[PDB]
Enzyme design. Structure first.
Site, PDB file in Angstrom:
ATOM      1  N   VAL A 179      45.041  34.645  40.329  1.00  0.00           N
ATOM      2  CA  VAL A 179      45.733  34.722  41.621  1.00  0.00           C
ATOM      3  C   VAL A 179      44.998  35.630  42.604  1.00  0.00           C
ATOM      4  CG1 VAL A 179      48.030  35.036  42.707  1.00  0.00           C
ATOM      5  CG2 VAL A 179      47.887  34.622  40.202  1.00  0.00           C
ATOM      6  N   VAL A 180      45.013  35.270  43.896  1.00  0.00           N
ATOM      7  CA  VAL A 180      44.452  36.086  44.977  1.00  0.00           C
ATOM      8  C   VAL A 180      45.578  36.483  45.933  1.00  0.00           C
ATOM      9  CG1 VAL A 180      42.663  36.443  46.747  1.00  0.00           C
ATOM     10  CG2 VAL A 180      42.165  35.038  44.739  1.00  0.00           C
ATOM     11  N   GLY A 220      46.092  32.659  47.444  1.00  0.00           N
ATOM     12  CA  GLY A 220      45.373  31.710  46.599  1.00  0.00           C
ATOM     13  C   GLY A 220      45.779  31.748  45.137  1.00  0.00           C
ATOM     14  N   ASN A 221      45.783  30.568  44.509  1.00  0.00           N
ATOM     15  CA  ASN A 221      46.133  30.381  43.113  1.00  0.00           C
ATOM     16  C   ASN A 221      45.273  29.287  42.494  1.00  0.00           C
ATOM     17  OD1 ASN A 221      48.453  31.801  41.659  1.00  0.00           O
ATOM     18  ND2 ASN A 221      48.044  29.855  40.641  1.00  0.00           N
ATOM     19  N   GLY A 222      44.829  29.531  41.266  1.00  0.00           N
ATOM     20  CA  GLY A 222      44.008  28.589  40.516  1.00  0.00           C
ATOM     21  C   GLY A 222      43.947  28.918  39.041  1.00  0.00           C
ATOM     22  N   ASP A 263      28.857  28.127  43.111  1.00  0.00           N
ATOM     23  CA  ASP A 263      30.011  27.530  43.792  1.00  0.00           C
ATOM     24  C   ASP A 263      29.887  27.683  45.310  1.00  0.00           C
ATOM     25  OD1 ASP A 263      32.349  25.892  43.831  1.00  0.00           O
ATOM     26  OD2 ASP A 263      33.709  27.637  43.681  1.00  0.00           O
ATOM     27  N   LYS A 298      42.048  40.072  43.886  1.00  0.00           N
ATOM     28  CA  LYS A 298      41.868  38.975  42.943  1.00  0.00           C
ATOM     29  C   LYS A 298      42.290  39.495  41.566  1.00  0.00           C
ATOM     30  CE  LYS A 298      38.556  35.556  41.260  1.00  0.00           C
ATOM     31  NZ  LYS A 298      37.268  34.896  41.686  1.00  0.00           N
ATOM     32  N   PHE A 341      41.488  30.320  37.444  1.00  0.00           N
ATOM     33  CA  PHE A 341      40.873  31.654  37.398  1.00  0.00           C
ATOM     34  C   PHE A 341      41.919  32.784  37.382  1.00  0.00           C
ATOM     35  CE2 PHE A 341      41.371  30.793  41.979  1.00  0.00           C
ATOM     36  CZ  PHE A 341      41.838  31.999  42.467  1.00  0.00           C
TER      37      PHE A 341
HETATM   38  C1  LIG Z   1      41.645  33.601  53.418  1.00  0.00           C
HETATM   39  C2  LIG Z   1      40.582  34.259  52.589  1.00  0.00           C
HETATM   40  O1  LIG Z   1      39.723  33.609  52.000  1.00  0.00           O
HETATM   41  N1  LIG Z   1      40.641  35.630  52.536  1.00  0.00           N
HETATM   42  C3  LIG Z   1      39.789  36.486  51.849  1.00  0.00           C
HETATM   43  N2  LIG Z   1      39.386  37.654  52.333  1.00  0.00           N
HETATM   44  N3  LIG Z   1      38.566  38.194  51.358  1.00  0.00           N
HETATM   45  C4  LIG Z   1      38.450  37.387  50.269  1.00  0.00           C
HETATM   46  N4  LIG Z   1      37.736  37.617  49.160  1.00  0.00           N
HETATM   47  C5  LIG Z   1      37.806  36.628  48.222  1.00  0.00           C
HETATM   48  C6  LIG Z   1      37.007  36.865  46.994  1.00  0.00           C
HETATM   49  C7  LIG Z   1      37.396  36.362  45.747  1.00  0.00           C
HETATM   50  C8  LIG Z   1      36.631  36.593  44.615  1.00  0.00           C
HETATM   51  C9  LIG Z   1      35.453  37.332  44.708  1.00  0.00           C
HETATM   52  O2  LIG Z   1      34.661  37.589  43.638  1.00  0.00           O
HETATM   53  C10 LIG Z   1      35.047  37.836  45.950  1.00  0.00           C
HETATM   54  O3  LIG Z   1      33.900  38.559  46.059  1.00  0.00           O
HETATM   55  C11 LIG Z   1      35.819  37.602  47.076  1.00  0.00           C
HETATM   56  C12 LIG Z   1      38.560  35.448  48.399  1.00  0.00           C
HETATM   57  C13 LIG Z   1      39.286  35.255  49.566  1.00  0.00           C
HETATM   58  C14 LIG Z   1      39.225  36.255  50.527  1.00  0.00           C
END
Ligand SMILES: CC(=O)Nc1n[nH]c2nc(-c3ccc(O)c(O)c3)ccc12
EC number: 2.7.11.26
Lengths: 25, 350
Positions: B34-35, B28-30, B146, B50, B32
């Site tokens: 990168v994930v 993920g990217n935005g 959100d 994140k 905010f």
């Molecule tokens: C495909 C997918 O969505 N995988 C994920 N597994 N765990 C995740 N956790 C977050 C996430 C982000 C920001 C936060 O503050 C948070 O608590 C949790 C986002 C995506 C994921």
């Protein structure tokens, strides 16, 4: 856009305009 | 490449430790940040990382919130670590979170593409777990801001739902203004469209009602093309708000004259074979008056979730339902007596 909504809120014309847009389509 | 960092445990103690991870990939990217998805070298467990640009002179709202939460329906913060941001105040905060393979969005899209409705047992399970996560965060005064299917993670086998992405979340304080342009348009509460800055955590309950309706319809209930069109979509169902509902949404908004539009019947909004208890629940969440919406704990106690309180309940795959009645004093704080309704006799300690 986002400017339009802010304007409608400040002018107190939001509901009138939303109702117009509903009837327009 | 194996990455080794010194990271601090999410819950506590504040004692840092070496953490090693591999198989790093962008998921993920935005705006905010990168994930990433990664695998911990010690346990082979999958994690989401994140990465956010942080001001040194200020505490990260998202980290502060995450360090407080310990709930089975909220993505756990395993570790957090800082990495060099080159600029004097700029640093990056890395949140190491539990990885969850699916989302309510993807699951619902699968069924929608197949032209089938998600089985009602999953609608009950997902919505109940969402209301539990909301009851929990709201008890700390934390508003997610959100709530959308994309932010609702799922373990497809166990049917466990975990709330994620606290990037928009805020600890709301009465009398301290909050931004009105918040939420994903389709899930945005009407008081936000009316420009309220004094809103409460009930905006999350409106969004939860939108998720429920979407699971019943197979598409978003209010698909606005803009902020103004979002209200047009709401009016097509709820009709126009009354002068009293406008005051309850935003006491600073005044509209002299406007044409009155009657509400469309809820039973006609949904397909004929929609469970009537699901429609009834939905009618108590998608209300103009923010204070008239059910609180998350009240929603958990709704008759729509009665099947979940049956001792003989099982998933369609044959497995047992996930933990549903392990309520804590914190989660029950908004209405402690409700515990004796939420915790069925078969669930109570021996
Ligand atoms: C495909 C997918 O969505 N995988 C994920 N597994 N765990 C995740 N956790 C977050 C996430 C982000 C920001 C936060 O503050 C948070 O608590 C949790 C986002 C995506 C994921």
């Amino acid at each position: 856009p986002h400017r339009l909504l802010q304007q409608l809120v400040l002018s107190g014309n939001l509901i009138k305009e939303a109702v117009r847009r509903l009837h327009s389509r | 490449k194996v990455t080794t960092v010194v990271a601090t445990p999410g819950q506590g103690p504040d004692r840092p430790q070496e953490v090693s991870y591999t198989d790093t990939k962008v998921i993920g990217n935005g705006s905010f940040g990168v994930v990433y998805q990664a695998k911990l070298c010690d346990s082979g467990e999958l994690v989401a990382i994140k990465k956010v640009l942080q001001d040194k002179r200020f505490k990260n709202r998202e980290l502060q919130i995450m360090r407080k939460l310990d709930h089975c329906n909220i993505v756990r913060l395993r570790y957090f670590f800082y990495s060099s941001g080159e600029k004097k105040d700029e640093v990056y905060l890395n949140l190491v979170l539990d990885y969850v393979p699916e989302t309510v969005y993807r699951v619902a899209r699968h069924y929608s593409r197949a032209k089938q409705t998600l089985p009602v047992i999953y609608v009950k399970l997902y919505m109940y777990q969402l209301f539990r996560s909301l009851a929990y965060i709201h008890s700390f005064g934390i508003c997610h801001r959100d709530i959308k299917p994309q932010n609702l993670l799922l373990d497809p086998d166990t049917a466990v739902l975990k709330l994620c992405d606290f990037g928009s979340a805020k600890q709301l304080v009465r009398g301290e203004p909050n931004v009105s342009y918040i939420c994903s348009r389709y899930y945005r509460a009407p008081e936000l469209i009316f420009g309220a800055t004094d809103y409460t955590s009930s905006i999350d309950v409106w969004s939860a009602g939108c998720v429920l309706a979407e699971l019943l319809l197979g598409q978003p209930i209010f698909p606005g093309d803009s902020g103004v069109d979002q209200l047009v979509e709401i009016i097509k169902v709820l009709g126009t708000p009354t002068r009293e509902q406008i005051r309850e949404m935003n006491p600073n908004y005044t509209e002299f004259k406007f044409p009155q539009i009657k509400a469309h019947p809820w039973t006609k909004v949904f397909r004929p074979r929609t469970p009537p208890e699901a429609i009834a629940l939905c009618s108590r969440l998608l209300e103009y008056t923010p204070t008239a919406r059910l609180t998350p704990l009240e929603a958990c106690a709704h008759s729509f979730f009665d099947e979940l309180r049956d001792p003989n309940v099982k998933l369609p795959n044959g497995r047992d339902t996930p933990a549903l009645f392990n309520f804590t004093t914190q989660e029950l704080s908004s209405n402690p007596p409700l515990a004796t309704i939420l915790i069925p006799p078969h669930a109570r300690i021996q």
